[PDB]
Symmetry: C3
Subunit: 270 residues, 3 copies
């Protein structure tokens, strides 16, 4: 993996190249990267220019009177990266002094009540790769970050979920805010019909290929976490059509505007 020092160096480099001092880190994923704008006093860095960062920009700025750092593009295991690389940035954020992490993503809907365009607050997750030992904490533990056996049952901050449901009310949305279980699998291919039925019977509400690893690490080093998925699909019958990456579209399709205001409004609630 990386050593404590590597994290530190990277955090020190950041601190001396910007005056920004974020309190919140937001990780934007798969077609979610619309908030660049809305940001005030923005400063951007290419991942390539930040020492030790994995092979895509880091932007600092103020969101709604709140100092943020945003990950514009994230890392996936299906790209060939080990989880210790995918989660490297989470640890740096903690070293910058961040206290809260917002994770977001696009996912396929398993719950029949779901509709394309829906937003699902992540109340909980299912770590399939973790079932088999693929875990960002695998390996000797780093005391400076956290304990050997972190608990995960309270990962998704309850209070933030409460505020998000409140904010949405004020937004006057026509549809309700969904809430549920996100399941992570490796990708990169899309699931078969059997697979989907299986996931659904296991109690999952949405399926994707990221986020979980980042939550675990976050929770391990003490960050408060809040996350949500933008729903975009999905196939459970043997008549049909197939899943398409061109549902990056849906991420634009109406999402951006709503998502953008939602996160913005939410900033006032930390």
């Amino acid at each position: 993996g990386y050593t404590y020092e590597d994290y530190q160096d990277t955090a020190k480099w950041l601190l001396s190249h910007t005056e920004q001092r974020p309190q919140v880190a937001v990780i934007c994923g798969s077609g979610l990267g619309g908030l660049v704008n809305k940001l005030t006093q923005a400063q951007t860095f290419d991942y390539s220019e930040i020492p030790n960062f994995p092979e895509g920009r880091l932007v600092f700025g103020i969101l709604n009177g709140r100092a943020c750092v945003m990950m514009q593009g994230r890392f996936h295991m299906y790209e060939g990266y080990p989880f210790w690389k995918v989660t490297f940035p989470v640890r740096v954020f903690r070293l910058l002094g961040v206290e809260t992490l917002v994770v977001t993503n696009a996912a396929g809907g398993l719950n029949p009540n779901f509709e394309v365009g829906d937003i699902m607050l992540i109340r909980d997750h299912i770590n399939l790769p973790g079932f088999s030992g693929q875990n960002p904490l695998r390996g000797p533990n780093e005391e400076r970050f956290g304990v050997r056996f972190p608990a995960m049952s309270d990962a998704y901050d309850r209070d933030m979920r409460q505020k998000a449901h409140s904010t949405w009310k004020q937004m006057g949305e026509q549809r309700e805010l969904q809430e549920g279980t996100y399941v992570m699998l490796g990708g990169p291919n899309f699931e078969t019909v059997a697979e989907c039925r299986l996931l659904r019977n296991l109690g999952a509400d949405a399926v994707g290929m990221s986020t979980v690893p980042e939550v675990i690490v976050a929770r391990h080093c003490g960050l408060r976490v809040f996350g949500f998925s933008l729903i975009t699909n999905k196939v459970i019958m043997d008549s049909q059509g197939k899943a398409n990456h061109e549902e990056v579209l849906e991420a634009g399709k109406q999402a951006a505007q709503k998502l953008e205001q939602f996160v913005s409004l939410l900033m006032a609630s930390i």
Copy 2:
């Protein structure tokens, strides 16, 4: 992994060592290797003599007026091979100009209606190792082969399944052709009772240790896929007997003759 070039080289070597130009690739697995005979204008190559091939023979010839290339022996992850090695041959076939792939295997029956000696057309699969990131597509994507996020819900060609059920009718078999969900796990030990019950509740019909990876790759680079399992077992009560590799026997026990004619007859149906 291997580079595009490696595939190509291997395909070029093959093309200049044989006059055969297959349209169909068939992968024979675990005691299924009886069709060597029946083949016309046969040409065999030891995997060891073909550059870049994984550590077992490749035979070209004509089956029922159809030019084929057959993999006599396949690779398993439980042997220590990464999926990029297990699936290497699929990519070479595409580069030879193959268009259809037939995959076959031996598996333990989960569906109680199943009987030793049964043949199950694979309508769909469950990729357990894929759940955790063990996937032949893991890693940077190769555009020359296919897209980043291939769909898998229509993997098993519907039209071929229709023809196979037709051919079987004409064969006048006493028993019916089964059809169902194949689940892949890593092996090499056989499953426990708990494991089996679990697999069954997940909707699987048959369990084995191969094929899935090969399908995924196949589908990724555009081959039409058709597959089937020869059923040979399996334990779900805590009175009993245990699973034996000496059920290679069953693969002979009556299978060969039926399987052989089935595949042969099927050739006329591509």
Copy 3:
């Protein structure tokens, strides 16, 4: 991995540094390490002094008139060790002439009928990492140890389970001996609520992060296996408290005394 020779060397070194010739190997895990005492003619070795051993002491002695070798501390995959390292000692034991293996551990209870302080005889297991290919037998097979495809449906010796339920009767315990399915996942974080519900619906009774690999290897080279879990937890509602490693406590809380006599009494039953 290790070569046959490495095992042998290690077994030879042991044999010439002690007069003890164990027949039973017991693996003590997570806060279970109380039996050091009770042992007679004890001889201890630090894992660090035994050639080839993974990075914690091996103690030989007599338990209840029975010659034993005990592993005081075991290896976990979540520590970064591959299964071939975690299971190395099992193979050495066979080479020392051991015939029976007792495995033990601490686990979280999934079965609602379970209570902290309960003892659960392991009747069967669920190998989640094995589902995905993470298996100590992965790789070329070693004939000197066992067959290529070992069966696992009769892993937990039936006769020992019968005797353990007999011994417990004589112990006059106030509560009954539980019996059930142990499920292994990688760790090191504790499970979420969703995860737990899932495991339970899959038929598991207890969940932990060890043992399974050791059983498989044991069974592969012919050892008779008996195992049990000491129950210590666990969270299935979204009111609650979280899982704590300070339930090492429970391993002391009353266990030690009972466990200690239980294993001791059991020695007379091999």
